[PDB]
């Protein structure tokens, strides 16, 4: 079961239980059993009868901005759902020191893997130096407040390792200023939904996190993991593809708003950040795929709720 | 209010402006922060886009309530987490049984209504005090249960021997009319989980009934106030005025069920049954939902719903 990604124009329908993709070329059927989430770049038309189709067997629609930004997502009904689970999530956002120790956890993981990446590229760091500042808050506002100096000094200390071309200098989100902020906007845009995908896979309710604010209206959890796993996954796939020389000028374009990358470079970027996707790690000693690490993420976040085992964040 | 779309046709931009196509009519969207889709709707790249830049949140239906799933855009309207405290009300124990005995107490009313309405004298309140007083969960259900077990014992009165319930039995059921109350039941069930899911409550935490079955467990909470005004009544009306005969029913290896025709007939008594008015029967519910919304963010103390007609 494997992400489908779509850049050409045209519709999805469902012509009875083959699900199709109508463009010019026309009527392609899709293998849904192998689908498991979906990203839309490409102008794309759903029928109603497609969408209760991807909506029957639990796939998770993600949708891109013009330049491939996250646009948002169709989350179909919950099949995992648990009602305790559930209650423990919102028990531990409730009684504030708990909430306290998870929300420190995610930062803590975010600067260490941050500082691994820096150590692994051979740029002298010490993020740690500010975690002090971390663990002895108080209020949630300021924990956030100093993750956020954190990931500007680790771009800026980045900076050192890239040419000019690709270096940052300011984070600039939406839109980019730079083929770099390009690159890992984009990047950042697939594993937002990457995660959020994962979740669905489990009985966590998405919305309940503990650094972020809770809102019904946004999958708050998946921007509390999306801090340990910027620096595991999005940052090395950039890091390789502009320093292997993937992508070149060739694949940025400049307009009036921002820039960005050209289709070309949106499929490169997409098949590599796939292929660190799938790539395996190996534990020196106990001798697994990076998406199955989030999934075990948030198994470990379970165990951690109903009081199993205390959570360490993944480094 | 939100925006609900019945009419089938297809959400697009123009160019910068919602329309809605077959016959273009624009939209106006400004006041608007969800959009309801019962229709057949298809919905353009352009327009989901334009939705999602609005933050506005798309939640889609069958014509016959099937929930499929919600778009959740990035864009972010402040908001709060109504899970929190539907869940801070089952972390609390006093504000658990409070809820708990709303339930209890709208069921038992209601079905003294009932009772009431089909001439049997029952005086079912007689078993409130036990309730009120009563400090654990499982004690509260037993009473119920009693209230229940008597208010069928009193129903079984008005029926004749065939559709007579003797025991409520489940699983699975040993007779016609309880073939019936648990078709008509499930029905109702996923009715409930229709109309809760076109509000922001959780469905898997309840107060009377256990989350920790992990399915739809609140549904079960409103359908202790539900199943005396629309699932009893229904049946009622069936096995009296003669919709249903023996022929209608099959015994099979282990219990009895509903033939195809069966169900076809009591789907359709439902169905009407739902949308017959007194503020249609299905509304009621999801007022019941905002009852429970009201409550549960402290500006309206709940009160459960009871029957006047
Ligand atoms: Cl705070
Ligand atoms: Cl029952």
Redesign the interface.
């Known amino acids: 079961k494997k992400p489908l990604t779509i850049f050409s124009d045209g519709t999805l329908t469902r012509r009875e239980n083959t699900l199709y993709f109508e463009s010019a070329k026309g009527r392609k059927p899709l293998a849904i059993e192998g689908i498991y989430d979906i990203y839309?770049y490409?102008?794309?038309?759903?029928?109603?009868?497609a969408?209760?189709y991807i909506?029957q067997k639990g796939i998770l629609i993600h949708?891109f901005?013009?330049y491939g930004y996250?646009?948002?997502?169709?989350?179909?009904?919950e099949t995992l759902?648990?009602?305790?689970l559930?209650?423990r999530?919102?028990?531990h956002?409730?009684n504030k020191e708990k909430r306290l120790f998870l929300a420190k956890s995610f930062v803590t993981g975010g600067t260490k893997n941050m500082e691994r990446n820096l150590k692994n590229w051979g740029i002298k760091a010490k993020l740690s130096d500010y975690l002090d500042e971390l663990n002895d808050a108080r209020k949630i506002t300021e924990i956030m407040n100093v993750e956020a100096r954190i990931r500007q000094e680790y771009y800026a200390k980045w900076d050192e390792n890239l040419p000019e071309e690709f270096k940052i200098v300011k984070r600039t989100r939406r839109p980019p200023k730079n083929e770099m902020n390009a690159l890992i906007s984009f990047l950042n845009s697939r594993l937002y939904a990457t995660i959020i995908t994962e979740i669905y896979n489990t009985?966590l309710?998405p919305?309940?996190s503990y650094l972020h604010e809770?809102?019904?209206?946004?999958?708050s959890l998946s921007l509390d993991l999306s801090e340990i796993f910027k620096p595991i996954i999005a940052d090395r796939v950039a890091n390789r593809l502009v320093k292997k020389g993937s992508l070149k000028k060739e694949h940025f374009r400049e307009d009036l708003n921002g820039v960005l990358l050209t289709e070309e470079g949106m499929k490169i970027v997409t098949k590599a950040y796939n292929e660190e996707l799938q790539k395996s790690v190996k534990h020196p000693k106990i001798g697994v795929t990076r998406q199955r690490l989030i999934r075990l993420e948030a198994y470990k976040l379970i165990k951690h709720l109903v009081g199993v085992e205390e959570y360490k964040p993944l480094v």
């Open positions: 839309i490409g102008h794309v038309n759903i029928t109603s009868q969408l209760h909506a949708f901005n013009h996250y646009d948002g997502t169709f989350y179909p009904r759902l648990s009602g305790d559930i209650i999530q919102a028990e956002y409730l009985q309710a919305t309940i809770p809102s019904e209206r946004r999958f």
